Amino acid sequence: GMTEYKLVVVGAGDVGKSALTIQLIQNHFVDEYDPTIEDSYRKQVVIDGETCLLDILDTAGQEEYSAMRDQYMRTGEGFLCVFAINNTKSFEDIHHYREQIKRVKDSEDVPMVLVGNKSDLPSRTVDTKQAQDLARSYGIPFIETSAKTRQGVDDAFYTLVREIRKHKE
Numbered sequence: 002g003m004t005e006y007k008l009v010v011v012g013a014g015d016v017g018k019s020a021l022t023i024q025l026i027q028n029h030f031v032d033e034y035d036p037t038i039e040d041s042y043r044k045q046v047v048i049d050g051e052t053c054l055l056d057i058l059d060t061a062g063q064e065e066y067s068a069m070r071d072q073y074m075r076t077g078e079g080f081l082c083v084f085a086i087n088n089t090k091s092f093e094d095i096h097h098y099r100e101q102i103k104r105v106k107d108s109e110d111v112p113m114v115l116v117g118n119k120s121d122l123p124s125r126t127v128d129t130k131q132a133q134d135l136a137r138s139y140g141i142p143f144i145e146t147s148a149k150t151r152q153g154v155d156d157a158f159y160t161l162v163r164e165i166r167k168h169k170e
């Protein structure tokens with residue numbers, strides 16, 4: 002049958018989680034998407050010749066560390082940890098998201114990709130080298146994206162699928 006991959010997009014508000022997701026789903030850039038909407042979206046894609054079903058949870062809202070929300074996040078098989086290259090705070094929040102993922106999955110080995118979004122913008126405040134070095138510290142890939150131009154979008158999601166596949170084995 003067709004394998005379904007449950008991917009979860011996390012990161013500070015305003016980094017482009019929704020815009021990245023909608024680029025993948027609609028093949029269209031949105032400059033506006035209600036910041037409070039957390040929802041999941043499915044798409045069939047071919048990755049390495051295999052048609053698979055992506056189920057992408059675009060997270061939103063305030064922190065909630067209930068048992069219910071933990072159990073829900075635990076259903077995620079891989080995580081995109083997104084920051085914006087023009088927002089230092091969003092980069093400095095990455096460790097929080099990574100630590101929450103390690104906690105809820107009870108594993109130091111969770112499929113994950115670090116995503117530096119808004120690569121089309123001139124206002125960079127986070128050096129590429131620093132982001133690459135953080136991904137190296139975590140042992141995960143780093144992908145530079147733009148939801149506006151589509152730079153890196155397939156690479157980010159497809160890399161995460163490839164990481165999930167390898168983790169199963």
Ligand SMILES: C[C@H]1CNCCN1c1nccc(-c2noc3c2CCC[C@@]32CCCc3sc(N)c(C#N)c32)n1
Nearest residue numbers: 011060062063064065066070071074094097101102105
């Ligand atoms: C960076 C910090 C601290 N400073 C203030 C802003 N902030 C902040 N804001 C809003 C949200 C989140 C946040 N943290 O973890 C999470 C989020 C949202 C996505 C889901 C996730 C990550 C995946 C594993 C689990 S498991 C569980 N229960 C979670 C929750 N909720 C989470 N942090």
Ligand SMILES: Nc1nc2c(ncn2[C@@H]2O[C@H](COP(=O)(O)OP(=O)(O)O)[C@@H](O)[C@H]2O)c(=O)[nH]1
Nearest residue numbers: 014015016017018019020031032119147148149
């Ligand atoms: N130029 C540019 N703007 C982006 C990009 N991704 C998101 N945005 C904008 O950043 C804002 C926040 O995006 P959104 O997807 O709502 O962020 P979220 O809170 O993480 O879901 C919106 O105005 C988006 O159009 C990107 O790659 N480039």
Ligand SMILES: [Mg+2]
Nearest residue numbers: 018019036061
């Ligand atoms: Mg959003």
